[PDB]
Amino acid sequence: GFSTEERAAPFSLEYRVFLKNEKGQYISPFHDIPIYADKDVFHMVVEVPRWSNAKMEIATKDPLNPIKQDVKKGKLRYVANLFPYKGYIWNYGAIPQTWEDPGDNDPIDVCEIGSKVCARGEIIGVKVLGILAMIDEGETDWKVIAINVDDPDAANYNDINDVKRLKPGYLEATVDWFRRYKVPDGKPENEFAFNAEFKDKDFAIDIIKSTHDHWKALVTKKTNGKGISCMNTTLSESPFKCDPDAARAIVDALPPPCESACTVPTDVDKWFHHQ
Ligand SMILES: [Mg+2]
Ligand SMILES: [Mg+2]
């Protein structure tokens, strides 16, 4: 289906993860992966495997939008181990061809709850089960809740109550994870500082389709891109389309693959307890 081309060493500053289609052509995971994998099955770009810490996401401003590691004041970012969790507690990522339009300014986020740990840059199909709406100091932050359609138990999951039923504690832990991530203190002062509520599958799909329409406007130049890189190699109706062979130079000009990988700071091991 899709595959990955990794440039430079993982957890280095130059590390990039580009996506390739069935034919070895470089494509943007933002723009060139269809939102739908099949009827009622959404594509998901996996950005971080469950239980990892590196904060890696689609580069919304880089040509071909490769996955790369976030950087804060010159240092590569890792999420904290929030006791009792190890790193991210879901496969975490995004639905391609969507754009929370400002809004967070990138593809709509997905928490994927299935049993398989997915790889960085892996493209999976997911069944949308619901959506977590969070108020973070007034702003709206959406997290789709989904499960790998290839999960052995996928047939048992069709709405958010199924998550409550067959994975007790998962939704609570999700809210807790995001609350302690956003308010490192622990508890916010009121529902403006942090609020959380889950909505069902139909609501989630309405939100997703809305962000897909916003993306449609983005890649057809009907809305200010606000710095988003819209270069793509497959969208026939997009003025930002570029010849695939021309786009290969974007990858080939970067350091070659090196899978003798940089070691992760020991500080990432530390576990932070809520007091
Ligand atoms: Mg988003
Ligand atoms: Mg986001």
Indicate the DSSP class of residue 232: B
- Counting ligands in written order, the one closest to the CA of 99 is 1
Question: Do the beta carbons of residue 182 and residue 109 sit within 8 Å?
Answer: no
136 is in an annotated binding site: no
Instruction: List all residues 6 or more positions away from 80 whose beta carbon is below 8 Å from its beta carbon.
Output: 53, 181, 270, 272
Residue type, 176: D
Task: Specify whether the CB–CB gap between 155 and 114 falls below 8 A.
Answer: no
CA contacts within 13 A on the Cβ side of 151: 22
Residue 260 C-alpha to ligand 1 middle, in angstroms?
31
Cα 140 from Cα 247, distance rounded (Å): 35
What is the experimental method?
X-ray
Q: Answer yes or no: are the C-beta atoms of 129 and 160 closer than 8 Å.
A: yes
What's the CA-to-centroid distance between 131 and ligand 2, angstroms? 14
Among the listed residues 48, 51, 58, 41, the one whose alpha carbon sits nearest the alpha carbon of residue 1: 41
Cα–chain-centroid distance for residue 43?
A: 11
**Is-contact 195 136, C-beta < 8 A?**
no
CA-angle at 79, arms to 104 and 226, nearest 5°: 20
109 annotated ligand binder = yes
Domain boundaries, the chain: 1-275
Q: Which residue has the tokens 């689609």?
A: 58
Token look-up 């048992």 returns 156
Q: How far is the CA of 110 from the centre of ligand 1 (A)?
A: 8
- In the three-class reduction of DSSP (H, G, I as helix; E, B as strand; rest coil), residue 272 is classed as strand
Neighbours of ion ligand 1 (CB under 5 A): 100, 104, 106, 108-109
At how many Å resolution was this determined?
A: 2.4
Residues 49, 117: contact at Cβ < 8 Å? yes
Residue type at 68 in one-letter notation: K
Q: Would you tell me how many other CB atoms lie within 10 Å of the CB of residue 84?
A: 11
CB 234 within 8 Å of CB 247:
no
Specify whether the CB–CB gap between 74 and 112 falls below 8 A: no
Distance between Cα 142 and ligand 2 center (Å): 8
- 257 with 7: CB under 8 angstroms? yes
The residues with which 128 forms a beta bridge, in sequence order, are 146
Nearest listed ligand to the Cα of residue 101: 1
Compute the distance from residue 245 Cα to the ligand 2 centre, in Å.
Answer: 30
Nearest ligand atom owner, CA of 100: 1
Place of tokens 């958010």: 160
Peptide bond into 63 cis (omega under 30): no
Pairing mode of beta strands 109-112, 139-148: parallel
Q: Where are the beta strands (DSSP E) in the chain?
A: 3-7, 16-20, 26-27, 36-38, 41-48, 56-58, 67-69, 71-72, 75-76, 81-82, 91-94, 109-112, 123-136, 139-148, 194-199, 271-272
DSSP helix/strand/coil, 83: coil
Q: Cα of 265 to ligand 2 centre, how many Å?
A: 24
200 labelled binding-site residue: no
**Token representation of residue 172:** 């609570």
| Angle 119-125-128 from CA coordinates, rounded to 5° | 115
Going from the Cα of 132 to the center of ligand 2, the distance in angstroms, rounded, reads 13
Residue 148 Cα to ligand 2 middle (Å): 19
Identify residues after which the chain is interrupted (C–N over 2.5 A).
Answer: 102
Task: Give Cβ neighbours of residue 23 (< 8 Å, ≥ 6 apart).
Answer: none
User: Which numbered ligand comes closest to the C-alpha of 178?
Assistant: 2
Task: Fill in the DSSP letter of residue 78.
Answer: B
Helix (H), strand (E) at residue 188 = none
Looking only at the bridges linking them, the beta strands covering 16-20 and 3-7 are antiparallel
Both tokens assigned to 266: 């020991």
The answer to whether the beta carbons of residues 32 and 15 sit under 8 Å apart is no
Cα separation of 57 and 104, whole Å?
13
d(CA 190, CA 186): 12
Å from CA of 228 to ligand 1 middle? 13
Quote the distance between the C-alpha of residue 22 and its chain's center: 21
* CA 169 / ligand 1 centre spacing (Å): 24
* Ligand lying closest to the C-alpha of residue 106: 1
203: β partners = none
**81-82/109-112 β-pairing:** unpaired
Ligand 1 center to residue 179 CA distance, Å?
A: 17
